[PDB]
Amino acid sequence: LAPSIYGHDHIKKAILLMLMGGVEKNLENGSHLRGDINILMVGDPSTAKSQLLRFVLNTASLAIATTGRGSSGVGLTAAVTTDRETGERRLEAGAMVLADRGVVCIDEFDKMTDVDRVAIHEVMEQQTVTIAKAGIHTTLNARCSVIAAANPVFGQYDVNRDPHQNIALPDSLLSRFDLLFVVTDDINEIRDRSISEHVLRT
Amino acid sequence: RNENFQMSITPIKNLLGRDAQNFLLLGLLNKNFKGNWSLEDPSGSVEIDISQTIPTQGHYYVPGCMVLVEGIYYSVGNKFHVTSMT
Numbered sequence A: 001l002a003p004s005i006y007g008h009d010h011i012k013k014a015i016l017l018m019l020m021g022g023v024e025k026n027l028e029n030g031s032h033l034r035g036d037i038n039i040l041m042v043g044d045p046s047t048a049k050s051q052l053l054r055f056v057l058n059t060a061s062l063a064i065a066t067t068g069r070g071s072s073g074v075g076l077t078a079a080v081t082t083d084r085e086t087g088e089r090r091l092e093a094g095a096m097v098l099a100d101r102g103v104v105c106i107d108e109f110d111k112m113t114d115v116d117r118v119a120i121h122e123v124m125e126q127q128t129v130t131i132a133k134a135g136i137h138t139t140l141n142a143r144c145s146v147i148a149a150a151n152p153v154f155g156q157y158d159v160n161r162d163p164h165q166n167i168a169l170p171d172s173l174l175s176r177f178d179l180l181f182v183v184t185d186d187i188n189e190i191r192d193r194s195i196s197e198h199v200l201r202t
Numbered sequence B: 001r002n003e004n005f006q007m008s009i010t011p012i013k014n015l016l017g018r019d020a021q022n023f024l025l026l027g028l029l030n031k032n033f034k035g036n037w038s039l040e041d042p043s044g045s046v047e048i049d050i051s052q053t054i055p056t057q058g059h060y061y062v063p064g065c066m067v068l069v070e071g072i073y074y075s076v077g078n079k080f081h082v083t084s085m086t
């Protein structure tokens, strides 16, 4: 995976297992346990977080790209529109629904407005989204691995302070990710030599 | 042009970050302003430790002399530990 990215071995391992998520369970009364693996890469700039998202976007069978500012919460779940073929109100699938039995890539994830992130919760918790507007009252499948990229509240990770203080997102959202990765561009001559000569070959 | 070299010289700037590895240098024998012995190349300079070295005996080794040097680079002190000099 991503042979043009140096290092990040544990992340590429997690990405591989996330492309190949575990079996979904269905239980009594139709009770449900999800099988996707949800990954959050949070860390310093220029740590290949976006490039790893772009590799995943090019490698999964079904991947939908999104970015924090560019994504509306409605544009993420599903949107009501009038089908001009007939004149009726109809739902248009958003990114989370289009990625069903696939993955969603989210770059600049912590830059989202919170009324967007309020719409992330049902996909993570229930693999579904629920619509209750325009006289349309439905639930849609959104069964997909979210992989996301973010930065701390400060421009770089501050090891003097706690993860909940470094990381912008609520704990009620962070707990829904399977693996929370923290990466840093921590300076070191040996690693810098290695990554540099790799990038020049690239 | 000498047959013995055509191992081969790495310019001093190539060393940086290539930790704990054998190299052959060619350099101007400085004494740095900090006082330490040193080699300089058009690409850069590095401080040297001579305390374990074996020079070849048919030569003088004054400052500013161009010297071929074999040694191990150590990034921890940014030193170049000299095996031998000629």
Ligand SMILES: Nc1ncnc2c1ncn2[C@@H]1O[C@H](COP(=O)(O)OP(=O)(O)NP(=O)(O)O)[C@@H](O)[C@H]1O
Residues within 6 Å of the ligand: A004, A005, A006, A007, A008, A043, A044, A045, A046, A047, A048, A049, A050, A051, A052, A149, A150, A151, A195, A199
């Ligand atoms: N380990 C690496 N190997 C090779 N290139 C790398 C590596 N880490 C970063 N880069 C390069 O850094 C550039 C920026 O990568 P990118 O994925 O946008 O970083 P990022 O983690 O998303 N930073 P940011 O969006 O500011 O939080 C790309 O051109 C990558 O090729």
Ligand SMILES: [Mg+2]
Residues within 6 Å of the ligand: A049, A050, A051, A107, A108, A149
């Ligand atoms: Mg990025």
